[PDB]
Every structure is written in C-alpha cells, then in structure tokens.
Write a protein that binds this ligand. Sequence first.
Ligand code: GA3
Length: 152
Amino acid sequence: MVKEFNTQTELSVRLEALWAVLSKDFITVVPKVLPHIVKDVQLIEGDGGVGTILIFNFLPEVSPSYQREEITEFDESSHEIGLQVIEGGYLSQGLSYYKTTFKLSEIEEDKTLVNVKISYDHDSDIEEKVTPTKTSQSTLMYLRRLERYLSN
Ligand SMILES: C=C1C[C@]23C[C@@]1(O)CC[C@H]2[C@@]12C=C[C@H](O)[C@@](C)(C(=O)O1)[C@H]2[C@@H]3C(=O)O
C-alpha cells in the first residue's frame, strides 16, 4: 500500500515566483539549479497541465539516467502540484510507486512555506532500499538550491 511521508521547508522567496518555477518553469530551471545531476528536461505529451508527461535526462554519470514524470495534480488556487514518477528514477531503485507533491503558502512577502508530500511503496523482493527519508532529503536540497537561484 502507498504510504505518505510529509516534510517541509521555508524558503526566503516570494510565493508566486516559487510557484512559477515549481509548477511550470522547471523545464528550463531544473538543469540550471541541478547542473551536476540533470542534463535536460522535455515535455513529451501535454503542455504543462494535468496529464503532462516529461522526461528528465540525467548526466551520463548518473544511474538511472532518466525519469519519466507525469503531472498528476495542478491546483493554482491552492498552489499545489503533484508530480508522479511513471518510469525510471526511483522506480528503477526498488520503489513500486513514487510521487512528490508540493503545496506552497505565504509566510511573509518574501518567505514561503513548502509542504512536501512523498507518496511511495516498495517491492520487498528487490534488495536495494531507498527510504523516503533519503528521497525527501534530495527534494529539500533541490528546494534550497532553488532558493539560492531566486535570491541572486
Ligand atoms: C535531486 C532530485 C530531486 C528530483 C529528482 C532528483 O534526483 C533530480 C530531479 C529532481 C526533480 C526536479 C523537479 C521536480 O520537482 C521533481 C519532482 C522531478 O521530477 O525531478 C524533482 C525530483 C524530486 O524532488 O524527487
């Protein structure tokens, strides 16, 4: 069964600037903020609303070298986006289901709360173990990098 792991971070960024990047501009911004991981991102189907499929190609060092992602939720009223791995990425590392959902809310004019929900399940017959503690840490690192990018 799918479990949910919640964490959060607060970033010194403006809510709508962060929402733009997390929900839309991540196509150009992701390789710029994670240049040691991500080579490029391409929209394969859809234009950025729900149902949109994207491929992330990682640097050739990296393994797995790609993930195919689907936008499964896009709520601009509540600033919530859900992004599901449908192939590759953690699904090549022992996880049977993986989704990341970001919900933003204002703390101040230039401070924003990011609630991060990781939805996941494992297949126990695969020996490699990857915990949502570990995967959440990667997501937070990405957020902190995004913070630095928006604040220069
Ligand atoms: C360091 C990370 C964090 C990634 C996976 C990665 O290994 C590299 C790509 C990051 C990411 C970038 C944008 C999206 O917010 C995310 C859910 C995704 O699909 O890809 C993000 C995704 C995630 O947060 O799990």
